[PDB]
Design an enzyme around this catalytic site. Sequence first.
Site, mmCIF file in Angstrom:
data_model
loop_
_atom_site.group_PDB
_atom_site.id
_atom_site.type_symbol
_atom_site.label_atom_id
_atom_site.label_comp_id
_atom_site.label_asym_id
_atom_site.label_seq_id
_atom_site.Cartn_x
_atom_site.Cartn_y
_atom_site.Cartn_z
ATOM 1 N N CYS A 107 30.493 46.097 -67.366
ATOM 2 C CA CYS A 107 30.203 45.998 -68.789
ATOM 3 C C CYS A 107 30.634 47.271 -69.502
ATOM 4 O O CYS A 107 30.089 48.356 -69.249
ATOM 5 C CB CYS A 107 28.711 45.747 -69.029
ATOM 6 S SG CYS A 107 28.325 45.622 -70.783
ATOM 7 N N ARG B 254 27.784 49.230 -72.254
ATOM 8 C CA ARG B 254 26.483 49.742 -71.828
ATOM 9 C C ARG B 254 26.008 50.977 -72.575
ATOM 10 O O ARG B 254 24.907 51.442 -72.274
ATOM 11 C CB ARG B 254 26.506 50.051 -70.335
ATOM 12 C CG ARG B 254 26.478 48.813 -69.453
ATOM 13 C CD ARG B 254 26.654 49.255 -68.014
ATOM 14 N NE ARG B 254 28.039 49.581 -67.683
ATOM 15 C CZ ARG B 254 28.396 50.222 -66.574
ATOM 16 N NH1 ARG B 254 27.459 50.616 -65.722
ATOM 17 N NH2 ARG B 254 29.686 50.453 -66.297
ATOM 18 N N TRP C 188 27.640 41.550 -78.532
ATOM 19 C CA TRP C 188 28.635 41.232 -79.534
ATOM 20 C C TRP C 188 29.995 41.421 -78.881
ATOM 21 O O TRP C 188 30.127 42.103 -77.866
ATOM 22 C CB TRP C 188 28.484 42.101 -80.792
ATOM 23 C CG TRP C 188 28.417 43.553 -80.519
ATOM 24 C CD1 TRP C 188 29.469 44.377 -80.200
ATOM 25 C CD2 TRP C 188 27.252 44.372 -80.529
ATOM 26 N NE1 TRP C 188 29.022 45.659 -80.027
ATOM 27 C CE2 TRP C 188 27.665 45.685 -80.231
ATOM 28 C CE3 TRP C 188 25.896 44.131 -80.788
ATOM 29 C CZ2 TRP C 188 26.771 46.749 -80.155
ATOM 30 C CZ3 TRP C 188 25.007 45.195 -80.725
ATOM 31 C CH2 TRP C 188 25.450 46.488 -80.411
ATOM 32 N N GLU D 266 38.304 40.090 -75.873
ATOM 33 C CA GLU D 266 37.747 38.977 -75.114
ATOM 34 C C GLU D 266 38.186 37.655 -75.718
ATOM 35 O O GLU D 266 38.543 36.718 -74.994
ATOM 36 C CB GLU D 266 36.224 39.052 -75.079
ATOM 37 C CG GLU D 266 35.653 40.359 -74.573
ATOM 38 C CD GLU D 266 34.134 40.310 -74.602
ATOM 39 O OE1 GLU D 266 33.585 39.582 -73.755
ATOM 40 O OE2 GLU D 266 33.509 40.964 -75.474
HETATM 41 C C1 HEM Z 1 26.300 44.934 -76.992
HETATM 42 C C2 HEM Z 1 27.616 44.714 -76.951
HETATM 43 C C3 HEM Z 1 28.342 44.393 -75.612
HETATM 44 C C4 HEM Z 1 29.661 44.465 -75.443
HETATM 45 C C5 HEM Z 1 30.687 44.933 -76.494
HETATM 46 C C6 HEM Z 1 29.969 44.082 -74.084
HETATM 47 C C7 HEM Z 1 31.220 44.036 -73.501
HETATM 48 C C8 HEM Z 1 31.471 43.398 -72.309
HETATM 49 C C9 HEM Z 1 32.753 42.886 -71.876
HETATM 50 C C10 HEM Z 1 34.061 42.976 -72.697
HETATM 51 C C11 HEM Z 1 32.594 42.339 -70.671
HETATM 52 C C12 HEM Z 1 33.683 41.646 -69.821
HETATM 53 C C13 HEM Z 1 33.430 40.152 -70.017
HETATM 54 C C14 HEM Z 1 34.556 39.358 -69.422
HETATM 55 O O1 HEM Z 1 35.640 39.961 -69.222
HETATM 56 O O2 HEM Z 1 34.367 38.144 -69.147
HETATM 57 C C15 HEM Z 1 31.210 42.479 -70.285
HETATM 58 C C16 HEM Z 1 30.650 42.061 -69.102
HETATM 59 C C17 HEM Z 1 29.303 42.105 -68.804
HETATM 60 N N1 HEM Z 1 28.272 42.442 -69.671
HETATM 61 FE FE1 HEM Z 1 28.458 43.414 -71.438
HETATM 62 N N2 HEM Z 1 28.791 43.754 -73.450
HETATM 63 C C18 HEM Z 1 27.760 43.923 -74.359
HETATM 64 C C19 HEM Z 1 26.422 43.658 -74.111
HETATM 65 C C20 HEM Z 1 25.827 43.281 -72.935
HETATM 66 C C21 HEM Z 1 24.424 42.966 -72.709
HETATM 67 C C22 HEM Z 1 23.336 42.960 -73.814
HETATM 68 C C23 HEM Z 1 24.269 42.651 -71.408
HETATM 69 C C24 HEM Z 1 23.012 42.273 -70.593
HETATM 70 C C25 HEM Z 1 21.767 42.549 -71.009
HETATM 71 C C26 HEM Z 1 25.563 42.789 -70.774
HETATM 72 C C27 HEM Z 1 25.847 42.578 -69.451
HETATM 73 C C28 HEM Z 1 27.101 42.343 -68.957
HETATM 74 C C29 HEM Z 1 27.406 41.931 -67.606
HETATM 75 C C30 HEM Z 1 26.347 41.720 -66.505
HETATM 76 C C31 HEM Z 1 28.735 41.792 -67.513
HETATM 77 C C32 HEM Z 1 29.584 41.376 -66.283
HETATM 78 C C33 HEM Z 1 29.165 40.003 -65.787
HETATM 79 C C34 HEM Z 1 30.130 38.977 -66.297
HETATM 80 O O3 HEM Z 1 30.068 38.656 -67.514
HETATM 81 O O4 HEM Z 1 30.944 38.489 -65.471
HETATM 82 N N3 HEM Z 1 26.458 43.151 -71.733
HETATM 83 N N4 HEM Z 1 30.553 43.132 -71.308
HETATM 84 C C1 LIG Z 2 32.438 36.047 -66.597
HETATM 85 N N1 LIG Z 2 32.509 36.745 -67.891
HETATM 86 C C2 LIG Z 2 31.544 36.075 -68.764
HETATM 87 C C3 LIG Z 2 31.704 36.434 -70.220
HETATM 88 C C4 LIG Z 2 32.581 35.696 -71.006
HETATM 89 N N2 LIG Z 2 32.725 35.984 -72.305
HETATM 90 C C5 LIG Z 2 32.026 36.977 -72.870
HETATM 91 C C6 LIG Z 2 31.143 37.762 -72.130
HETATM 92 C C7 LIG Z 2 30.374 38.804 -72.859
HETATM 93 C C8 LIG Z 2 28.985 38.897 -72.680
HETATM 94 C C9 LIG Z 2 28.256 39.824 -73.407
HETATM 95 C C10 LIG Z 2 26.772 39.937 -73.182
HETATM 96 C C11 LIG Z 2 28.904 40.628 -74.338
HETATM 97 C C12 LIG Z 2 30.286 40.491 -74.499
HETATM 98 N N3 LIG Z 2 30.952 41.243 -75.400
HETATM 99 N N4 LIG Z 2 30.968 39.569 -73.789
HETATM 100 C C13 LIG Z 2 30.966 37.470 -70.786
#
Ligand code: HEM
Ligand SMILES: CNCc1cncc(-c2cc(C)cc(N)n2)c1
Lengths: 418, 414
Positions: free
Chosen positions: A116, A119, A288, A293
């Site tokens: 992520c 974070r 957000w 993405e």
């Molecule tokens: C607040 C703005 C946030 C942004 C800009 C952000 C950004 C991202 C991005 C770009 C990814 C890659 C997603 C993909 O390539 O499919 C990601 C993955 C992830 N995010 Fe964040 N995120 C945010 C918030 C959060 C929150 C609130 C959580 C959990 C409480 C979180 C947990 C995760 C996890 C566990 C992953 C990897 C698991 C997966 O989606 O395969 N994120 N995030």
């Molecule tokens: C396997 N990846 C799952 C996935 C797909 N699309 C978007 C997100 C994602 C999730 C969150 C919390 C924030 C963000 N900015 N993006 C995660």
Amino acid sequence: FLKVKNWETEVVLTDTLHLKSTLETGCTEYICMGSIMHPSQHARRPEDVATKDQLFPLAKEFIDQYYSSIKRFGSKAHMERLEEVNKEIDTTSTYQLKDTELIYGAKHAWRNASRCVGRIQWSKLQVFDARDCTTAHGMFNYICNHVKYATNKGNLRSAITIFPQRTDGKHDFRVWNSQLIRYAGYKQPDGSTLGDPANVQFTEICIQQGWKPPRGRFDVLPLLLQANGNDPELFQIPPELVLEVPIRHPKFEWFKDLGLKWYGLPAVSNMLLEIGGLEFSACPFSGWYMGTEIGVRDYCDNSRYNILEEVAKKMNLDMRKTSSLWKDQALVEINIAVLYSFQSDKVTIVDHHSATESFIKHMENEYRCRGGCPADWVWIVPPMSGSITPVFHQEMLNYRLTPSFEYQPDPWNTHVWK
Amino acid sequence: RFLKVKNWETEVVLTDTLHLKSTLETGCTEYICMGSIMHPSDVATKDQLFPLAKEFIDQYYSSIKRFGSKAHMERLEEVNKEIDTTSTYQLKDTELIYGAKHAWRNASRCVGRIQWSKLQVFDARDCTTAHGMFNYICNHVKYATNKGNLRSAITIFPQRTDGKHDFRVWNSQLIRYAGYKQPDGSTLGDPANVQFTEICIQQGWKPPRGRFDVLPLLLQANGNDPELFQIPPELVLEVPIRHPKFEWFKDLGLKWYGLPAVSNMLLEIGGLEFSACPFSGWYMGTEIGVRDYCDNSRYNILEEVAKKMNLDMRKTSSLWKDQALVEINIAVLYSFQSDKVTIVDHHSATESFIKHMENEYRCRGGCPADWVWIVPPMSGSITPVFHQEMLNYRLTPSFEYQPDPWNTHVWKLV
Ligand code: HEM
Ligand SMILES: CNCc1cncc(-c2cc(C)cc(N)n2)c1
Ligand code: HEM
Ligand SMILES: CNCc1cncc(-c2cc(C)cc(N)n2)c1
Ligand SMILES: C[C@H](O)[C@H](O)[C@H]1CNc2nc(N)[nH]c(=O)c2N1
Ligand SMILES: C[C@H](O)[C@H](O)[C@H]1CNc2nc(N)[nH]c(=O)c2N1
Ligand SMILES: [Zn+2]
């Protein structure tokens, strides 16, 4: 003690946090699995109801970590909680988190999510305790409230809603949707795909469950919600809760004619939240978007909306050969449009330059206060313009800390229907 | 044991057995992955050398379907006698060629390995002086450049003996541009080569002090002090960079050289260490247009190109850097193709690597690959390698990094 170097700034960070990692990465000294999507099946407790000697050590570790975090290690309340968790496991084969522990656990699962880039925000997470939920209707209510809170009329707020933890594995709470808000995909008679090809299988399950598909390119999928192991139930998210952004371009007035839109709320709903050996199989969380993405992956993956050809045509690019970089040129314009559109509509979005810069700052913060920051370079580096973002030049160490978010099987592969 | 890699775009699944043949460390542990670390994780004794040599001879004779043959057994006997009597041994020419090709084939960070078996190997193991090295390198440059129809080549200088007589090319590449720090803190030319430019100047090089000064060769033979040589300018093919649509792009004064020739790595073959082994292929456009031109620490031309594009540079979300980056890379490919200098764009190169990788899994049981390096530095996920799971492990023969020679050389003159 491991050092990571930034090859742009020559800043070197020294990692000691990795000494607290619990799960195998999948790598060995002879093989690196860093680009494997799911390299490890190393879980902290067997598939279903652990015995006492299997669950209590994990619980003790988390309670220890939580009371350590609040400078209360060995305190009266720490020792009582241990005794309390002991009795609960003795008499129910499980235990119940305190509200404070749940919140701490959820924030730290996000803080520990090496994939992520977002974070820097980890401690600003709104935690909705939905552990009193008993039915799919209740799950729908909880999810509607989450979506409304998190959307906040475009001023998005990070949030997670935590449904009852797993018990024996046959009473799982599951959101069957991979995200709360996603578009349907339809297999066409001729063989092409309408809408989002990623969701064709899920869409067919919804249709087969009685969903009446409008059969357009951007049909918001119903929620398919499973409570206490029962058959999942369909619910239509009230459309006034589903914030969407029509995609237009600041310069190309024809761009709007492509009819593209996206939703504003990224809300992952298919992952498992692991805290102290407890498994929360339904824990939808949202933040957000980073523009890429949508603009790179959702729109331009060959197996997704695959819009490069359509955009390049309108741009009058030479699509005869790869070396004109017509895909690259259209890719940039698409991502300009996505950001411009969200921003025009005052929907929170971050470009990959700002997001990656924040993540470097977050890494430095975490090394300074925590002694490390697990980070998956393969996922952190944006899918376009990699090396002109700072994270490309940033060495990272990847390791698995608990609490964590874990992947889990799609429920239709494991669910015995009734 | 088997390991599966999946391509998440095509859902093709490949099965790796070749990883069982590694015995060199990746740097990762069971609990920490160091895949994004640039450089993770004194000469071999007789005892150390024997099994390394056997392993290589065994795999050479297996490759030619002569494992267990009389020639195989006599070669092992002969290698053992040399190690016993001389503490080292000499590769046969066939083994040298095979070893060099397989070091390339084994280079997990190289996207251009579909070409691995068409490598021209120049045996320079009879070289004794820096003048001889210059001659060998000139011939290499001329052969490889081939008037723009570039041919992969490697020139292999004498192996390490006691570590006190190493052959080394001090240049990081055979052809690279000088960098000069200015008193005002700016840099003229290539900032990556400021330190090596300083060494050259200190050794007597009279620099033109321009933006694209081809560096002299700094060549060390037999552990002696390195010596300066000017590559004959007619052997250095260069491409002026212009853009197919922006007539102003040529006014930037950009050029690059056509021949990418890495000269600072170590070639390990059967325990033998070839510390001077310059090799060359042809460029992938993004190496020049993304990294060399647009790295903040390199020529860093994004600002200037965006200005001439009249882009809005006040906010990052205009993606002005991304827009300028693409046009620069268009210019690079257009310019090389117009001058009929071999070049490959990142879409073609990554597509070819996937075909290569699949072929390697089919005929060899796998293909070690470093995703962090294979994925191009722009437009990552619109290339197929982005969606390809890869396994990284270290096979030998191999190309290895080695310390820069100025950090270990102890000087002799005066
Ligand atoms: C607040 C703005 C946030 C942004 C800009 C952000 C950004 C991202 C991005 C770009 C990814 C890659 C997603 C993909 O390539 O499919 C990601 C993955 C992830 N995010 Fe964040 N995120 C945010 C918030 C959060 C929150 C609130 C959580 C959990 C409480 C979180 C947990 C995760 C996890 C566990 C992953 C990897 C698991 C997966 O989606 O395969 N994120 N995030
Ligand atoms: C396997 N990846 C799952 C996935 C797909 N699309 C978007 C997100 C994602 C999730 C969150 C919390 C924030 C963000 N900015 N993006 C995660
Ligand atoms: C024939 C055309 C070739 C192409 C298109 C190609 C492509 C590339 C690229 C783009 C890189 C990454 C360079 C960087 O980012 O610094 C690379 C690395 C590498 N290449 Fe290839 N290459 C070619 C030929 C060769 C040859 C002939 C050899 C050796 C005989 C070789 C061995 C290597 C090695 C060892 C590395 C990683 C070492 C390093 O530079 O850090 N390549 N290649
Ligand atoms: C650390 N990497 C060194 C480097 C720098 N520039 C270019 C290359 C390179 C080398 C070769 C043989 C082919 C190619 N297409 N590129 C390698
Ligand atoms: C095989 C490879 O690991 C896979 O395509 C990964 C690469 N990096 C990624 N990075 C992000 N952020 N999201 C992804 O889905 C992927 N996919
Ligand atoms: C920190 C990171 O490992 C480093 O910047 C790497 C990333 N990937 C790369 N990939 C290639 N091809 N070349 C490089 O120099 C790098 N640099
Ligand atoms: Zn690894």
